């Protein structure tokens, strides 16, 4: 569980991005949502990083390649980059769930 | 903490709100004045929320979310981005408080 | 401090009324005459809400809504905003107040 | 007490079945012009005959509520179901407010026990 | 239980009228129909206020206004007649039996 | 009472005959021959149903009933009111003989 | 009185033939041929079913059921009128006698 | 007794299986020629074989109620499915008829207990 | 059980027409498919007699008109042929099976 | 017996392999070279279930399956009737060797 | 003779990899660079399945399976056909180890 | 044992997680160049991180299954669909491996009781 310091943090950022994700599946957006999206994006990795240990810090930004700052991606390279964080934050999650439920066996 | 939500009926009762919204907004296409209302509707109750979170989170939520330009007119799409931001980050802060008061309840559960 | 609201049948039938009109604006379109009705309705109601909540409740709804333009006839989606705002803060409230009294049970369970 | 605030359960809960019934029989089909006007009219007089089961407070909050409609011209489905779906709302909120109180004195003549 | 003098005759007459709105809304009608269903919709209403109370044969006629007798009502206007009928006897049963129930109770 | 249908098995049978009439007629079109087929069984079965109730029952029915016009063939809509009206009176009556037959059963309950 | 029906086994089985039949003239439009080998079937159903049952039974389903004009091959819809009586009527017919039956179940019980 | 009715009950019993199975055939998609003739020539020979495996009375009643088919011309499709449905709805009453035998045995056969 | 001399092999060659019935209603067949099936058809029924009882053999024997050997028959007529096989097979093992099933009550 | 079957894994595996590649060709329309490929799987096939029966089963499966003419290339539906032929007769001969079993477990329950 | 099957849990995973692929084959059609690509795959896991099963079983499926031909690229019904026989085959081998084991476990209950 | 196979079960399973989310992503809609790229440097360094995690034997089993991508093209939604399927199923299987083994554990540490 030392592999994620702040965990609460962790969850609910990365219920936002799960959620986002939901909304840009639900209907094809437009060139100032898309904006507004990928600078959302940008953010929430920066907050998970600040909640996350270093070695997984480090981890996920080998995994991830930010997007360019000045050019806006289309609808489905967002759902990629989001659909990245989500999977692998509910992998980390599972990991850390097969952990609490060892323990509960331990005791 | 669960100290970290200051005011917590207050946030639920924001949340529920923009839920609700969301849910409309995602019901059938907007015409101009009801994109600008629910812009306002966005920026205040941002606000509200702000009052019932301790600092901490009051800075977190400022530093993930982005005003509207007060001159122009959102369009669904950016406004239903704006929103489900909101409403994943508060359903996650609440699994949260969740995941504490259910610990409180174990412990209590325990020493007996 | 169940005393936030203060008039709690009151404040339950109104939300109901706003409910049920809400499902109504969303179930065809509307006319003129209609839409100018639903607005009254919206404002009376708001009136009688406040009339049934603590003063910082009145003063957070207040500060949450504004009210209809009379120069104009809204349009359904306008409405629909409108009504949508007051029955998602509703519920979020009546929620409240149901976990605070579930609460209490389990203190004196 | 809240109970006492409808004088008379049996009639404002069947005029209410009734106003429920024609709502959804409104948003059942399309309607002409004499539906629409034996519909007002019932909309009237069930508006008084439910004003009489109720306290005053009641009464006076209904018609603070209610705006009768405009007898010179006929109004349309989507009035008419507006007018039926405030009713409706407002009844449905009035009972589980006495639902409520019933409880409310179900969980008292246990508690003593 | 005073209001309802004949229970078995004011439920049967509702029986009738509630299966015969079932059929208003299974198919548009004719002439004819309308002709015999208007005067059934009299009929009807004569026999149920032989089985109610005073009060109730007072206030079911300040409800409902008789159709013309030389005119042919539409659909909308019977199937508007029929369910006023249908949902003011439903709320009455409604009532005596929330009564009976209290009864039920009480002893 | 439950006395009042003097003959209940006669009253159950013609009842389900018109029934299943009805919803015969409500599963495709007729034509000439059929229709007029429908309305004399309707005719009859009035007969047979007034043999088996009581008098306050035949002048009651006889009060809802109106017969066909019978140098005329009814229509479709025409036939599935009469019989709807038929089905719709007959199964209120047996909900009353069951309210009463049931209030037995608990008076029998209930001495005990 | 059970004994309204003399033979239950027959009644029962002519009574299924027919439900089947009627299940099958609802299934597809029919031929001319096929019409009339089901309206001879009709006709000879029914005085098996006279032969199984009570007199005064007889003589109401008498009272109730026309028989076919020979001189036309009927409509589709004709045959399924005339067995649909049929099929109603015998349903009910048994109904009635399982009522009592269950009813002299319970005197013994 | 009614049991005493079908004299071969293994044997009836098939022949109505098997009859039943092609009934569902013939609804599950139109037929040819050819196939018309087969299923003709098989309504004839079960109603053989059916008649070898019950009582008398049971023989000739099925007689009065089925007639053959025409020799000189093929039936179609219609009369096909009216010939083969009359008999399943007349075999499955006749063994409602003998379930109601057998169980009525089961009734007595408890009772003296 | 003495109709059934062999039950093992006469409940998998009745299998095994089931199961090509229901092939037949899957799809329409060309030529060569329905040479392969009268065939399989013939054989089958040869392999079922060596299964059955002389009764039962001589009783499928008049209930059953072989196919044309040198005509290829249709979709129809061997759908036919075949729901005639498998619908006697069942009924023949409804059969074996109350007689089981009396045996199991008998001790 | 269960003896008719020597090797009772190797047949079950060629089953359910038949079975997957049935439904497979009913899955889509195939072209040339698959359903020649799917021909040769089906000689190999029976030449490995060949393998696997007694005598009695391999002579039976030989006088109820015929080859596929090696010079053309079958049709989808020649390939469905010899694939269902060969799947119909396997799930057969197993609730044959089942109703064996299962007679082996009731005898056991029996003699206690 | 569980020990037919050397490494089960490298053909248990090779199973997985094929039918998850046998999915995506079904899921949409393919292009030339993904059915050479899935030609390659089906070459080299049959070569990771003979590395897990005993030699009698790796001949059998040699027997069974031919190779692709280089030459061409499939086409997406005949990867199908192969991948197909190669997951048939080995949900049948593992039925029988599982009857086999499930049948120890009553040896020993 | 079979356990460590897997030398960092943690990172294996999220890696996994991560590319099975991605292969649910890319069949909900067709993807633009843009998405190919990042989806095809995605699947080279995931396959990294997964062989970081993994025993040796089974690094050089995945890496004589898996083939990298042609860097001067980029691949097509077919390629990239069929190389992460292909992980998913990998993967799947390789847990219900490790998933046999401690369910193995659980009933050797019963069977000594």
Partial sequence: TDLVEQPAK????????????????????????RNRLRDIHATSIREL????????????DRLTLPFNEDAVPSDAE?????????????GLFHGIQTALFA?????
């Fill in 10 to 33: 962790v969850m609910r950022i990365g219920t936002m991005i799960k959620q986002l994700l939901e909304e840009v599946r639900a209907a094809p957006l437009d060139e100032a949502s």
């Fill in 49 to 60: 990083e600040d909640g996350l240990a270093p070695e997984l810090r480090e981890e996920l």
């Fill in 78 to 90: 967002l759902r990629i980059a989001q659909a990245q964080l989500v999977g692998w934050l509910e």
């Fill in 103 to 107: 323990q509960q066996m331990a005791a």
